[PDB]
């Protein structure tokens, strides 16, 4: 995955 | 959102 928590990239 | 963890929709 989410804006601001998209731990992949 | 990912594969069969997308709590949206």
């Known amino acids: 995955x989410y ?3 998209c ?3």
């Open 3 to 5: 804006i601001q928590n």
């Open 7 to 9: 731990p992949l990239g």
